[PDB]
Amino acid sequence: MASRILLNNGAKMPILGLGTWKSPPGQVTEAVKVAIDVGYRHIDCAHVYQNENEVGVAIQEKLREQVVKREELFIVSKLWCTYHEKGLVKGACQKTLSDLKLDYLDLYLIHWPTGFKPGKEFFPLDESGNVVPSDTNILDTWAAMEELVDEGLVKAIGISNFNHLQVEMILNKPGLKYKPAVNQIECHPYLTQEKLIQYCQSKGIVVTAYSPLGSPDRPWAKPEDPSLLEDPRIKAIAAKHNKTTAQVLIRFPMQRNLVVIPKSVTPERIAENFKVFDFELSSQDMTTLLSYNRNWRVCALASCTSHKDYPFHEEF
Numbered sequence: 001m002a003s004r005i006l007l008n009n010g011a012k013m014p015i016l017g018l019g020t021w022k023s024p025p026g027q028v029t030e031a032v033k034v035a036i037d038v039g040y041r042h043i044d045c046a047h048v049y050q051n052e053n054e055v056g057v058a059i060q061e062k063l064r065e066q067v068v069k070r071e072e073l074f075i076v077s078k079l080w081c082t083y084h085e086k087g088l089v090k091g092a093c094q095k096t097l098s099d100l101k102l103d104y105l106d107l108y109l110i111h112w113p114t115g116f117k118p119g120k121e122f123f124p125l126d127e128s129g130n131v132v133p134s135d136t137n138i139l140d141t142w143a144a145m146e147e148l149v150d151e152g153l154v155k156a157i158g159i160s161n162f163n164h165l166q167v168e169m170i171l172n173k174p175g176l177k178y179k180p181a182v183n184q185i186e187c188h189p190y191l192t193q194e195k196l197i198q199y200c201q202s203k204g205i206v207v208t209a210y211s212p213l214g215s216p217d218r219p220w221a222k223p224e225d226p227s228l229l230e231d232p233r234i235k236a237i238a239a240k241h242n243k244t245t246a247q248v249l250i251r252f253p254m255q256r257n258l259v260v261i262p263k264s265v266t267p268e269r270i271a272e273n274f275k276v277f278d279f280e281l282s283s284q285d286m287t288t289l290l291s292y293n294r295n296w297r298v299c300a301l302a303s304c305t306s307h308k309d310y311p312f313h314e315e316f
């Protein structure tokens, strides 16, 4: 299938990218270098991941080496929750640009719909452990994102972890200038997201699937938890196709017209995970994988469940 999907800003986005959350700073430069060498052209980043400087070293070295041209790369980052105030958005974007050593981002996302009190701490807490919210709402943060397009800092803007009513709020914003291009959400066979995906796709918003392998390195994992990579039913589909379980888990969202961003710092897995353009899952395979949904989430924080904009109380 085609390697890129057309966004509603007129640009094309590679359907496979490299994730960087949890990639150690002493390993991520080589991970990104290897990824670019083996064909990746989309890197998913964020300020909160604390490794954008090291990602940037890799990007700059591959541009200097002329392995790739800047126009061939698709670099994504995200505005952290403590920067939702309109007066902080530009500086947050500029810090990311400085660290990544770029003069524009291809896509900049509101990382979560929940704004937090500005300051040095990424999760500012009250004395009882609740996150301290900001009063800035999503619509004003969206207007600040639109300014970044008009200043040339970013080519596209979007959202992440927004539920369908929050997407709808953006789409219904008085005076909306640019629609979200992307909603980046958790999606895999245990959290298949049919309802939210259909809503976003019906509005022309491209969905990116995060944690497609079930994030086995997430810091809050428990030994009892479900494991996609070890599920014998998924292993059987992979064996039938002479592919790895990870390759099936990556191809699955691709065939739903999603973008997918598996993370690895292991050179052999970075290369393996890209070898997903040479086989097809059948419709029956796809429906079987969808049947494994259990509404299980890698990403959600008990500390934010009382925030007015917490996204996961709604069904979708």
Ligand SMILES: NC(=O)c1ccc[n+]([C@@H]2O[C@H](COP(=O)([O-])OP(=O)(O)OC[C@H]3O[C@@H](n4cnc5c(N)ncnc54)[C@H](OP(=O)(O)O)[C@@H]3O)[C@@H](O)[C@H]2O)c1
Residues within 6 Å of the ligand: 018, 019, 020, 021, 022, 044, 045, 111, 160, 161, 184, 185, 209, 210, 211, 212, 213, 214, 215, 216, 217, 218, 229, 244, 246, 247, 261, 262, 263, 264, 265, 266, 269, 270, 272, 273, 298, 299
């Ligand atoms: N927008 C958001 O709120 C949000 C939230 C979560 C994630 N994300 C993005 O999505 C990316 C991907 O999600 P994720 O990092 O949570 O997890 P993931 O991509 O589902 O899983 C990553 C884990 O799988 C392992 N792995 C990778 N390829 C493998 C293979 N072929 N065989 C076996 N194990 C393999 C990695 O190990 P090694 O690295 O040791 O090889 C790592 O432990 C993130 O890095 C981030 O960029 C965004």
Ligand SMILES: O=C(O)COc1cc(F)ccc1C(=O)NCc1cccc(C(=O)O)c1
Residues within 6 Å of the ligand: 021, 046, 048, 049, 050, 081, 112, 114, 299, 300, 301, 304, 305, 310, 311
């Ligand atoms: O967020 C990602 O991309 C990956 O997870 C992280 C990565 C980090 F470097 C540091 C913290 C996290 C994290 O705890 N996220 C979950 C999160 C964040 C903000 C609000 C909510 C909420 O439930 O409202 C949930």
